[PDB]
Amino acid sequence: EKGKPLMLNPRTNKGMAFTLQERQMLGLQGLLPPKIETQDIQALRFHRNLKKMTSPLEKYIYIMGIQERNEKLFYRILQDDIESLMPIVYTPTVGLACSQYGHIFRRPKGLFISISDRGHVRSIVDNWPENHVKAVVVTDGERILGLGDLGVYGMGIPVGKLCLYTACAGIRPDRCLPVCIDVGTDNIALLKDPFYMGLYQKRDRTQQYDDLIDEFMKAITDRYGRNTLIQFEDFGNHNAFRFLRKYREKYCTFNDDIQGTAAVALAGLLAAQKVISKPISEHKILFLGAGEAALGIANLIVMSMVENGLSEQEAQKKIWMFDKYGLLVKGRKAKIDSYQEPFTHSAPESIPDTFEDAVNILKPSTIIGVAGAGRLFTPDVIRAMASINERPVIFALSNPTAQAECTAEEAYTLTEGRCLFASGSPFGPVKLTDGRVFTPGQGNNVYIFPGVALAVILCNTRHISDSVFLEAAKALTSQLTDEELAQGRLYPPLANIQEVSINIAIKVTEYLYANKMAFRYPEPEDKAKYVKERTWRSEYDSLLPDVYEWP
Amino acid sequence: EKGKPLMLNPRTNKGMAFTLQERQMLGLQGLLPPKIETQDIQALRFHRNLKKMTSPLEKYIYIMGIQERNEKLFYRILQDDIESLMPIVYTPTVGLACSQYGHIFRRPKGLFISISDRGHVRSIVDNWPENHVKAVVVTDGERILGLGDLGVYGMGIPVGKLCLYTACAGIRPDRCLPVCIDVGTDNIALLKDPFYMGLYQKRDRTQQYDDLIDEFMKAITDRYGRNTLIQFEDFGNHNAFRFLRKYREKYCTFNDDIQGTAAVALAGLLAAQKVISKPISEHKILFLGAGEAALGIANLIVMSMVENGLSEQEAQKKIWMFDKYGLLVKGRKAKIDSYQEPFTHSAPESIPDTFEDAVNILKPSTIIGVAGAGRLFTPDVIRAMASINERPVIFALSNPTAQAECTAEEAYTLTEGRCLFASGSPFGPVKLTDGRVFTPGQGNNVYIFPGVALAVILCNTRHISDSVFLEAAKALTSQLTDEELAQGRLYPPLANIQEVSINIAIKVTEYLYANKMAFRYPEPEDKAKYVKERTWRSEYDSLLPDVYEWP
Amino acid sequence: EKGKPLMLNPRTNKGMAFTLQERQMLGLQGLLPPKIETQDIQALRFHRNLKKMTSPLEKYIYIMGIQERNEKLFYRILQDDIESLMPIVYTPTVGLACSQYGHIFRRPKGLFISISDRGHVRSIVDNWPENHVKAVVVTDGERILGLGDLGVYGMGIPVGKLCLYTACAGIRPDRCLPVCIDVGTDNIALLKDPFYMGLYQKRDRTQQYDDLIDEFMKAITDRYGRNTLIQFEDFGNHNAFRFLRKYREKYCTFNDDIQGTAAVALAGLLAAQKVISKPISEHKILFLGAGEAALGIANLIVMSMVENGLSEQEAQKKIWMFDKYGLLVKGRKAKIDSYQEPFTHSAPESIPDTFEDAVNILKPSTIIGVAGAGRLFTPDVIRAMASINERPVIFALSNPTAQAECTAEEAYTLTEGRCLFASGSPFGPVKLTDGRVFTPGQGNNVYIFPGVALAVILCNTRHISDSVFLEAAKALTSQLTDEELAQGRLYPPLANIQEVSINIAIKVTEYLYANKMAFRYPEPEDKAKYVKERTWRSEYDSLLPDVYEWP
Ligand SMILES: Nc1ncnc2c1ncn2[C@@H]1O[C@H](COP(=O)(O)OP(=O)(O)OP(=O)(O)O)[C@@H](O)[C@H]1O
Ligand SMILES: Nc1ncnc2c1ncn2[C@@H]1O[C@H](COP(=O)(O)OP(=O)(O)OP(=O)(O)O)[C@@H](O)[C@H]1O
Ligand SMILES: Nc1ncnc2c1ncn2[C@@H]1O[C@H](COP(=O)(O)OP(=O)(O)OP(=O)(O)O)[C@@H](O)[C@H]1O
Ligand SMILES: Nc1ncnc2c1ncn2[C@@H]1O[C@H](COP(=O)(O)OP(=O)(O)OP(=O)(O)O)[C@@H](O)[C@H]1O
Ligand SMILES: Nc1ncnc2c1ncn2[C@@H]1O[C@H](COP(=O)(O)OP(=O)(O)OP(=O)(O)O)[C@@H](O)[C@H]1O
Ligand SMILES: Nc1ncnc2c1ncn2[C@@H]1O[C@H](COP(=O)(O)OP(=O)(O)OP(=O)(O)O)[C@@H](O)[C@H]1O
Ligand SMILES: O=C(O)/C=C/C(=O)O
Ligand SMILES: O=C(O)/C=C/C(=O)O
Ligand SMILES: O=C(O)/C=C/C(=O)O
Ligand SMILES: O=C([O-])C(O)C(=O)[O-]
Numbered sequence A, B, C: 001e002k003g004k005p006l007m008l009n010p011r012t013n014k015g016m017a018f019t020l021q022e023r024q025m026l027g028l029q030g031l032l033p034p035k036i037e038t039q040d041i042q043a044l045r046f047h048r049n050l051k052k053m054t055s056p057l058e059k060y061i062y063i064m065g066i067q068e069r070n071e072k073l074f075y076r077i078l079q080d081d082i083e084s085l086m087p088i089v090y091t092p093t094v095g096l097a098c099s100q101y102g103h104i105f106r107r108p109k110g111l112f113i114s115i116s117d118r119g120h121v122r123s124i125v126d127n128w129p130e131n132h133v134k135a136v137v138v139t140d141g142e143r144i145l146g147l148g149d150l151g152v153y154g155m156g157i158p159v160g161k162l163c164l165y166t167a168c169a170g171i172r173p174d175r176c177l178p179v180c181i182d183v184g185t186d187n188i189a190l191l192k193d194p195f196y197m198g199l200y201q202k203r204d205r206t207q208q209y210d211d212l213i214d215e216f217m218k219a220i221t222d223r224y225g226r227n228t229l230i231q232f233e234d235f236g237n238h239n240a241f242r243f244l245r246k247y248r249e250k251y252c253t254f255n256d257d258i259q260g261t262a263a264v265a266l267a268g269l270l271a272a273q274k275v276i277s278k279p280i281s282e283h284k285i286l287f288l289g290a291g292e293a294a295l296g297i298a299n300l301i302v303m304s305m306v307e308n309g310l311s312e313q314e315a316q317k318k319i320w321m322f323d324k325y326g327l328l329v330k331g332r333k334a335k336i337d338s339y340q341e342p343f344t345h346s347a348p349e350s351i352p353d354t355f356e357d358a359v360n361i362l363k364p365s366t367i368i369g370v371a372g373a374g375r376l377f378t379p380d381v382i383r384a385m386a387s388i389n390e391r392p393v394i395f396a397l398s399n400p401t402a403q404a405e406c407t408a409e410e411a412y413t414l415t416e417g418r419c420l421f422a423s424g425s426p427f428g429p430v431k432l433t434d435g436r437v438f439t440p441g442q443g444n445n446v447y448i449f450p451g452v453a454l455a456v457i458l459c460n461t462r463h464i465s466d467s468v469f470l471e472a473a474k475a476l477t478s479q480l481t482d483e484e485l486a487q488g489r490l491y492p493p494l495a496n497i498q499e500v501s502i503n504i505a506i507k508v509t510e511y512l513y514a515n516k517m518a519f520r521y522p523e524p525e526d527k528a529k530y531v532k533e534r535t536w537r538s539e540y541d542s543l544l545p546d547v548y549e550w551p
C-alpha cells in the first residue's frame, strides 16, 4: 500500500524517518515535515518527554500509545532500557492499567470474542488483518495477576505479554495475536461501571463456556495452522488445568501461570541450591497456596529431584502446601482435587492453624508464596524461617506488588541478610544497617515464555511437554554468573533479558530436535546461528521498490 | 474501505460507538471490545481524564491527539465546552505548543511545501488524500502570533485555525487543509535545535520565495477549484500586504491578521460607542504599532466613519499611529510606506518620545495595542487615559498573553472601572476592591473568520472585498445584548461562539447575494435555513450499507 | 475488500449470480443488471455461444478468457464437459495457441522471470498477489510439446497444466502459480516477430542460466515453503534431467515429461498386458526416440519388471532404443549419455538403418513413439509389427497431433484391428470396413499429474521418489473396467477424469503415509474421506458477512 495509509498503519509508519526517496516514491512527499530524522533522534524525543512525566500510569499511556503509532520505534524504545520500563509496561503498573482499562481507553488492541458470538467465532478470526499468526496469548480475565476477576479489562495482560514476546525474544509483532474471551464478569464494581468494556452479565459457567473455548481453538488453528502456539494466560483455577489437560495433546498450547511460573521458580531454586548446597534428603518445601503456580512449581520440582536420584513418591513427600483453608492433610474438610493429592500428606502431630504454625511444625527449608492474597509472610513467619534455617529460601511470587507475600526489605532485614529471596514484582536493592547491600532477583515468568515461545515457533513444534519447561528452567539458571549470585541474585540481570531469552531459545531448540519434537526441516546444523538469524529487529527496513536497469 | 482501515482513519473511526450491525457488516466484529458505547459515554471518559491533568500543554497534547484518532469525538468534546478549551487549543497554549512543536511531535498534520520542492508543488498537492478541499489556511511561520519567526513549528497555527473553522461554523473537516510553506527560518535557536521540523537554512527572501508562493496558489486552485478559500495566516509584515494585494482579485483569498483582526476590533469599537455615545467628531484613535493589525483596523474604522457621514480624508485625520520608532509624522527619519501615509500626519507641536507622551499630547479617546511586544500599556499610560477620558477605550490585542499590552486587572483597577477593555488573549473576570466585577471580552479574530469563511464557501464567492469584513463586524456587534454590555463585555460570550458564527455567516451570505458577489445557484429564498442545513455536525453518522427487500 | 474491485477480480466475481443481499451489503447494487442469475443460467449462456463458434483457436480465446473474468464459472464450464473441451484447452489446440501467443494476447497469466532479472528474482516473487501457493508449474519454453523452442510463447503450457490441476483434481486455483523463465530463444522466427513477448536474444546457455533457476527455486520456497510442489514442464533434454537430479532431493519437485509421461505410458502397458497376457520373458520393447519420455518410461518399465521377478539387468536387456542417429548400440558413433547406457546393447547381427529395419531385426512386441518428429510409424512399420505379433502394442505419444508417430485410423486399419493402440493426442473412434469399432485411449500425462500433485500437496510430502509414479501408474490402470478394455481402451474414459484423478490421489496418499513420506499430522483414519473433503468446488460460495443478533 502507498500514500497516507502507510502512515496510518503503525506497522509501516516511520514518521520523519521515511527517507526522501521513500517519500517521493510512496507518495508521502508533503505529508511529512521537510526534516529527515533517524531512529536515534526519535528515541531521544521519547526519553526527553518520559523524563518529565510523573506517574507510572501516565508513562504507560504514553509508551503503549507509541505501539499504535510507530511499531518499530515502540520496540526500539523498550530495547533502549528494558529494565526501567519493565515496571511500567509490565508488573506492577500493568495491573493498574487493567483496573482502569475502560478509563484510559483510546484504541483497541487484540481480538475480542464474546459468548454472544458463539457459532460465529470463525467470522471474527477472519476479521483480524494479519495473515500469518504464529503466537496467540488468550485470557478470559478471571484471574488477572492477583487482582481477581477484571473481565474484558484484562485484555491489557495479553497485550503486555506479547510486547515481551517481541521485546525479549525477537518474535515478529505482526505474527502475534492478543485475545480476550468475554463470557461476563462476577466483578460487581465493573457491572455498574459505565466505562466497562465487556458484556454486562455474570460469568457464564455452563457448557456454553467450554463450547466457546472449543470453537475458538478450532477457528484459530483452522485459519493459521495446527501448530499455532496458543498461550493461556490468567484463567481461573478450575478452567486453567482442565483446558491445559484437554488441549495440550491436541494443539500446541501451554499455560503460563502453571508452567511458565513453574519454570522460573525452579530456575530460582536451582540457583539457591548452588549457594546452599543442601543434601537432597533434607529438602522440605512449604507452599503458601496450592493453585496454578503451586501445583505447577511442585510438579516441576519433583521432576528435577527424580532426575537427580529420588523417586517420584519420595520427592512428593518433601513438598507441603497450605491454602486458604489451611494445611493440605488427608481427610481435611476442605476439598482436595486430583492435582493436590500427591502433595496431601497425613496430618502431622498437631495441625497448624496459621502459616506461622506450619513453619514451626514442619520446619521447611524453603517457603514459596503463591497465594496472590497479600502480606501472608508476616514478620513472625520470616523470623521463624531464619531461626530454623541458616540460609532460608523465601520466594514471594504473587503480583502485583500489593499482593506480594512480603517485600525484599522485610525479608533481608528480618533474616539479617541470610535469606535467598526472590519476588514476582520488582524491588530495588536493600542495604542493611551494617552496610551490606542485597540485590533481589525477580522470579517472574517473563524470563521463560519469551525464549520458550521462540524455540517452539522456530521448530514447528506440535505439542509442548512439561520436560520443555524443565529444560528452560535449567537453561535460565545456567546463565547465572557467580558474581551475580554473590550479590544475592537468583536470576540473570533483567537488563540482559534479550540475550538470556535467546540463549534459552537456543537450548530449547536443541532439546526439541534431540528428542524428536521439532518438525522444521531441514534440521539446522548450528542451532545458535539458526535462532539468531531469525530474530526480528527494531531497526527500520527500507520500503523502497526494487529499481534496477536491464542489461 | 472496510475492516481495520475504518478504525485506523480518524475520519471514520467511531471506537466502541460502532454499532453491532456496523461491526458485523464492515468486518470489525472482534476488533473492538464487546461493549457498544454512545458518544455521550466517550465524552464522559474524556472529561474525567481532562480533570485529572495539570498543565495546559499536557491537555493540548491530549485533546489534539484525539483529532488523530476519532475526528467526530474530537469536535464533540470541543462543542461540550468551547469556552474552557479555547485557551488550550488556541491562544495562549497554542503559542506554547508551536514554540515546542518538535519536542511534542507524534503525527504530522497538514501539507508541508518547502523551497526545496519548487517546480514540484503540484505533485505534493496531489498527495493530499482528500479530494474536495474548500478551505486552506497557510503560513510561512515568520510571524506566529507575537512570538516571531518559528519556522515549521508554526504549523500548529493553521491546524488550530481549521479546528475552529469546524468547531465554530460547522465547516466540514475533510474539506479543510492546513498548509505550511517552509523556506527556512531566521530563528537562530531553531537552526541549532536537533528536533526542528524544517529546513536548516536562513529564510530565502529572493524571487524564489515569490515563485514558490505563486506555484502553490496555482497548484491548489488547479486541483480544487478557482473559488477555493485561501486564508493567509501569520506571514511577516512585508509579505502579508503584498500577497494580499497581488492575489485578492485573482483568487478567493484574505489575510486573517490584517482583515480578520480588523473586523473583530471594529466590532468592539461599535459596541463601545453604544455605551459611550461619543460625538463622531471627537473620536481620536491612537495605535500602538502600525503594521498588519493597525493598518487593517484603521482602514476598516475609516470605512465605518465614511459610511456614517465623514469623508475619507477627515476620518483618517482622527487616527494616529505610534510604532517602534515613534509617532508617525510627515518627514520623520523612520520609513513610512504607502499603507501608512494616510495616517501619517504633520508633526504636532512637540514630538512625543514615548507612548505615554503621545497619549498626553494627542489625548486620544481610544487606545489600541497591536505591537506584539509586551506590556507597553504601562500603568502610567493607563492612568493618563483615565485622567483624559471619563470612559477610556483600551484594547490590548497582541497574543499570546505574555505579549499583551496590559492585563484586564491593570486596565480596570487603574481606571477605577471606567474603561471599556478588550484583549486578544483570555483574562478572567476582575473584581475591584469596592466589589464591582468586570468581565472583559476577547477581541480575537476567532469571532470573525469562521462565520466569514462559511458564508464565502456556501455562496461560491470568487473574491472577498473589504466591505465583507465591515458587514461581519456589524453582524458580530448586532448580537451583543444590553445585559452583556452592562457586564463590561464588548463581544458576545465565547460560550455562544457557535451560534454567533452561524448568525454572522447568515448575514454575510445575505450581503454577498444582495451585492451580486455570490455565484451559488439557485439563490436560496431563506438564507438562514440554507446555512443551518449545511453545517457539519459532530454526531455519528450511520455507516451501514443500504439493505432492503425487493418487491 | 468491497465494491467494484469484487467484480474486477475473477477470483471473486460472480457476475449476475451475486445475490440481492450480497449486492446491497458489498456495495454492488446498481453496478449489476437487476436480474439475479444462477450458475446454471451462466453455463447455458456459454454453451449456447460455444455452439455457434467454428475454429478451435477462437473457442480457446473465449473460454480461457472466462478464466480472467469469472473463475468459478470457468471451472464449472470445464466440468460440464471435460472431454469435449480437453482438445481446446489442452492438446492439440494449446499447441496452436502457444505458437500464436503474442498474436492473441489480451491479459497476462502467471509470473515471468527473465535472465535480465537475475539478482532480483525474490522481488518478482513477492509481487505475486496470492500468499499461499502450493503448486507451481514452470517452463523455459525450450521444448513445448513437439513444437520445439517457443520462448515466452510457451507460457500457455503452464497455464493449461494448472487449469487441469483444478478441473481434474480439485486443487485450489488461488494456490496455483504458472511460471515462465525467459533466458532468450533460438527460434529465429520469433526473434523477428514484433509481437514476441520475451527477450530478443538467443538462449543463454552459460552458468548464468543455471544460477537463475537456482535463484528462482530458492525464492519460491523462501516465500511459500520448502514443500511447495514445483512441476518442471517442457524443458530441453539436457536441462530436464540435470535439474531433476539436482533438485529432486532438495525440493519437492518432479518433471512431468520424464516422470508424468513415464507413469501414464506404463499404465497403458499394464492394461495391454491384461489382454495379451504375454510371458514376462518374451517382452521386447522398442523405443522411437531416446530422450525425456523414452528414458522415463524405460526406467519405470524396468521397476515394474523388477518388482515382478526379473532383475534390473535382465529387464533392461528387453528394452531397445532408436533415436535420430539410429539404434543405440555399444560403440556407435553418436553420443550415449549415462541415462542411456543401461539400454544401449551390443550391436545385433545387422545394424538397422531405419526404424522399420529395427522392427524386422529386433522383432519387438511393443513399439513406443516418443520422438516428437511426426509420422515416423509409417504404414510399413505398422504392417511389420502386425506380421511379427498377433497383438502388437503401438504407442504414438508425441504431441500435438501433427507430431504424432501415426494416427489411430492407420494403426487399427493396417493391423486389421489386432493392435492395442494409444496416443498422446485425441483421435475419435475408428470403424473398420468390416464394421468393428475401435475406441483408442489417450496416453497423456494429464491422467497422472493432477492426482499425484493433489496427494503430494495434501500429505505435505517433501520429496517425490520414482516409486510414487509407479504407484500412480498402477492406481490408474486398476480403474479400467473389463468392458472398456473390450472397446480397445487402455485407459479409463476421459469423461471420468475427475473421479479417476481423485482415486489416484487417494491411492498415492495411502502410499505416502505407509512409506513414511507424508508429514501432514495427524494421519487421517480414512484417506478417501480425507481427500474428498479437501477438493475445491466450482459452486459459488456465499460472500455475505456474518450477521446475527446478540442474545
Ligand atoms: N522471528 C520470528 N517470529 C515469529 N515467527 C518466526 C520468526 N522467524 C521465523 N518464524 C517462523 O518459524 C518457522 C521456521 O522458520 P524458517 O526460517 O524455517 O521459516 P520458513 O518456513 O522458511 O519461512 P516463512 O515463514 O516465510 O514461510 C516458520 O514457520 C516461521 O514462520
Ligand atoms: N489468605 C490465604 N492464605 C493462604 N492461602 C490462600 C489465601 N488466600 C488464597 N490462598 C490460596 O492461594 C491459591 C491461589 O491459587 P490460584 O490458582 O487462584 O492462583 P495462583 O496462580 O496459584 O497464584 P499467584 O497469583 O501467586 O500466581 C489457592 O489455593 C488459595 O487457596
Ligand atoms: N459544511 C460545509 N463545509 C465546507 N463546504 C461546504 C459545506 N457545506 C457545503 N459546502 C460547499 O458549499 C458549496 C455550495 O453548497 P451546496 O449545498 O449548493 O453544494 P452542492 O454543489 O450541491 O454539493 P457538492 O459539494 O457535494 O457538489 C459547495 O461547493 C459545497 O462544497
Ligand atoms: N517596542 C515597540 N513599541 C512600539 N511599537 C512597536 C514596538 N515594537 C514593535 N512595534 C510596532 O508594532 C508593529 C508590528 O507590526 P506587524 O505587522 O509585525 O504585526 P501585527 O500583526 O500588526 O501585530 P499583532 O501581533 O499585535 O497582531 C510595527 O509597526 C512595529 O513598528
Ligand atoms: N484443495 C486444495 N488445493 C491446494 N492445497 C490444498 C488444498 N486443500 C488443502 N490443501 C493443502 O494441503 C495441506 C494439508 O491439508 P489440511 O486440511 O491439513 O490443511 P490445514 O493446514 O489444516 O489448512 P490451511 O492450509 O488453511 O492452514 C495444507 O498445506 C493445505 O494448504
Ligand atoms: N527423426 C527422428 N527419428 C528417430 N528419432 C528421433 C527423430 N527425431 C528426433 N528423434 C529422437 O527423439 C528424442 C526426443 O527427446 P526429447 O527429450 O527432446 O523429447 P521427449 O520429451 O522425449 O519427446 P516427446 O515430445 O515425444 O514426449 C531424441 O532422443 C531424438 O534423438
Ligand atoms: O518521534 C516520533 O516520530 C514519534 C513519537 C511518538 O509516537 O510519540
Ligand atoms: O473514548 C474513546 O473511544 C476515545 C478516546 C481517545 O481517543 O482518547
Ligand atoms: O486487450 C486487448 O485485446 C489487447 C491488449 C494489448 O495488445 O496489449
Ligand atoms: O506476571 C506473572 O508473573 C504471572 O503471569 C502472574 O500472573 O503472576
Ligand SMILES: O=C([O-])C(O)C(=O)[O-]
Residues within 6 Å of the ligand: B091, B144, B145, B146, B234, B256, B257, B398, B399, B424, B444, B445
Ligand atoms: O489569534 C490571533 O489573535 C491572531 O491570529 C494573531 O496572530 O494575533
Ligand SMILES: O=C([O-])C(O)C(=O)[O-]
Residues within 6 Å of the ligand: C091, C144, C145, C146, C234, C256, C257, C397, C398, C399, C424, C443, C444, C445, C446
Ligand atoms: O501433454 C503432454 O502429453 C506432454 O506434456 C507433452 O509435452 O507432450
Ligand SMILES: [Mn+2]
Residues within 6 Å of the ligand: A145, A233, A234, A256, A257
Ligand atoms: Mn499470569
Ligand SMILES: [Mn+2]
Residues within 6 Å of the ligand: B145, B233, B234, B256, B257
Ligand atoms: Mn494570526
Ligand SMILES: [Mn+2]
Residues within 6 Å of the ligand: C145, C233, C234, C256, C257
Ligand atoms: Mn510437457
